[PDB]
Amino acid sequence: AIPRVAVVVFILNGNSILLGRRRSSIGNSTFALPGGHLEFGESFEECAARAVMEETGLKIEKMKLLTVTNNVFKEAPTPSHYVSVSIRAVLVDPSQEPKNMEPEKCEGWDWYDWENLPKPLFWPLEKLFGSGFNPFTHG
Amino acid sequence: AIPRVAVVVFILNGNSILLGRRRSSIGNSTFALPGGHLEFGESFEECAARAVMEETGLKIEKMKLLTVTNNVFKEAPTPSHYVSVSIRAVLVDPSQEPKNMEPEKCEGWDWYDWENLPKPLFWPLEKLFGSGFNPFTH
Structure with missing residues (x-):
């Protein structure tokens, strides 16, 4: 039981980011x-x-x-x-649409506006946003 | 026996705190x-x-x-x-609603306004409030 490194990606498309509902023992059904x-x-x-x-x-x-x-x-x-x-x-091609390539881990992927994010957000993501973190401006 | 350390939590949501009636040999049915x-x-x-x-x-x-x-x-x-x-x-998510995950210890959880707290309060909590303790300002 050691800490494991994950990479998570804020894919920015206009004013939107890509999110999907988890299929997981952790945070099931959250975005x-x-x-x-x-x-x-x-x-x-x-x-x-x-x-x-x-x-x-x-x-x-x-x-x-x-x-x-x-x-x-x-x-x-x-x-x-x-x-x-x-x-x-x-995106390399801004018209490219997402597909649900690993349904065992996600219900499907869609774009959500920064000012109209869906609920419930997976709590690590909600907690990060609650700090004031903004993926469009962070630098 | 020896004294045991417990941690009790004032979850503040607006002007409210979360309370539930105990199921316990001590203070049964008190908030x-x-x-x-x-x-x-x-x-x-x-x-x-x-x-x-x-x-x-x-x-x-x-x-x-x-x-x-x-x-x-x-x-x-x-x-x-x-x-x-x-x-x-x-709360991390201010709209998250509580659930009664351990019904053997509690009848259920709800939010109570600071100025409209329920009765009977569990005596250790009432005793602490009676000292003038305020979790919003302490």
Whole structure:
């Protein structure tokens, strides 16, 4: 039981970000970012693009580091600890539509306006936003 | 026995705090705070968040130490002595509703306005309020 590194991606499209309802023992049915586990030797940017491609089929570019959060899930069925590196990115083709490529992990992916985010947000994401974090402006 | 450390949590939501009627040999049916026993190696703030999650499902943040009380129950069915650390917190999601996740310990959780608190309050809580303690301003 060690902390594991994940990368989560804020895909920015106009005033919207991509979110999807989790299928998971942690935060089931709450809206969360696409993302994945960092693999050995992988850069944050390579992981962001790979996880996004694997989950959504979307092709992203201009990956930029935003922040890092410490997320402990002691009450989970298997207790877990993730260190989540957040990456900002945009679409290579702004008309490309998302697909639900890994339905075992997500109900489906859609775009949500910054000022009309859906509920319930997965609590690490809600808590990050509650700090004042803004993926469009953070720098 | 020895005195046991408990953490009790004032979840502030607007002008309200979360209370529920106890199911317990001590103070049965009186209104009390969510809380739990402090575990070895745990911080007060970690205990507060864990106990609130386990009893109410609520996710809390901004945990802050308020005070500590000495609560001896010599007349209890099993005599007991708790040292209760009070923590203030707020909801991560202000619209999240509580659930009765441990009905063996509580009849259910609801929000109560500071100026319209229910009766009967659990005596340790009433005693603390009677001192002038205010969780919003302390």
